[PDB]
Amino acid sequence: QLQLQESGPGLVKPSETLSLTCTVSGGSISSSNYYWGWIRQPPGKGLEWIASIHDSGSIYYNPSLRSRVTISVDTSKNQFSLKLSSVTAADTAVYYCARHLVWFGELRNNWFDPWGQGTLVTVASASTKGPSVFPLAPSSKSTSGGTAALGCLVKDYFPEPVTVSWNSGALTSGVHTFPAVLQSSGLYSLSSVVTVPSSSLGTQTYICNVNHKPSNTKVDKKVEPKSCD
Amino acid sequence: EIVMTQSPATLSVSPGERATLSCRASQSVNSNLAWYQHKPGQAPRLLIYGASTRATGIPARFSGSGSGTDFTLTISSLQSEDFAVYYCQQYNNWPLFGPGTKVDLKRTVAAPSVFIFPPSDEQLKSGTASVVCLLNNFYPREAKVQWKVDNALQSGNSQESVTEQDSKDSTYSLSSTLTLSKADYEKHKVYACEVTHQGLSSPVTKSFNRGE
């Protein structure tokens, strides 16, 4: 089955150039009569298409970005890339790669099917900071019935995003990872909580796995009940 | 210049009824119109192209109708799974998307479970104290969370974040974080979190005293 995967820097300094690569697998880009493109979505704004490229080297441009877009295809590694020049904060966004069906026949085709999962780019004048991870400890005060709540708090990181899993992916039921909030310091802070049978509190080990890619920070924090004295 | 508008911006729908959604163009787009589904954190998915044509693999409960300036996407027998944002996209000249409509689910009211967490001792080394209070698996989304330290109420030192509507049981969760400094976290002894909400007959207060 056809799949697209973006990869590229979470952080790009303003006045510079942002580059992304899509790696298509489960289908070949050449030979193929499909264009291959990039769509972006700024935070809290609509989708905007950018540019697409066809195996033949034809390039379909969204006119309002043309002057800043360079798009290319490496047919051998099954990869097309996007380079966007002179970036500003207006360019902070989730960038998706997609297959672009263009056709001018009897029923036009000009749509995107299928899509990748997006990658968050951030245009910031700042420097990456990895998170500090703290446990949200179970207590009598975090139990209701036979269920208990525990979690860990991912603080002071930049930029987004962090991924949080529990027990190396083994625990995914009852997990709630919240949207990061912006703190006054200018950095992000998040918190992942899980509800588990309280009967298993002292016997099952609960570890939260934090991964902040933009700074190669990985943290594993065992979550035990806070010394109750 | 073509302009894609959608209405309503957001829509609450009982599990099972038919959600009808609307896209509008400034000038005409004939039938050069597609619809996408975008569940949060997942990839967009092409539902309908041709303005009447279901893409392969899409249930028959999704249907597109309309032409020129007025299109309507309708989801008969809405499931909880279907919670997402739906964008239209015209392609009369080149790809232009509409602002999108958020489809929320309705369900019976569900009171939150409230849990409270004192700050980690590891964090107190650093000079700050984060107290967290958690409302778990409630409906609807609106909830008042007030903090109280030594029965003193606070302001401007708390933040919340709510999860996406759960795609299975259609509920919400919320976390409030009261951030203080190590010093004043010690100058006071009771930390309380008062919750008011439609599933509760009266407000409820989770609190803990420092060090139990």
Partner: peptide, 30 residues
Amino acid sequence: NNDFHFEVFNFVPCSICQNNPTCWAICKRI
């Protein structure tokens, strides 16, 4: 703004024009 802008394309490849007559006026065989 409607009816096919081909200016937005750098060129149009004859491969996606079908039988469309106006597309076959600007298209370029590869």
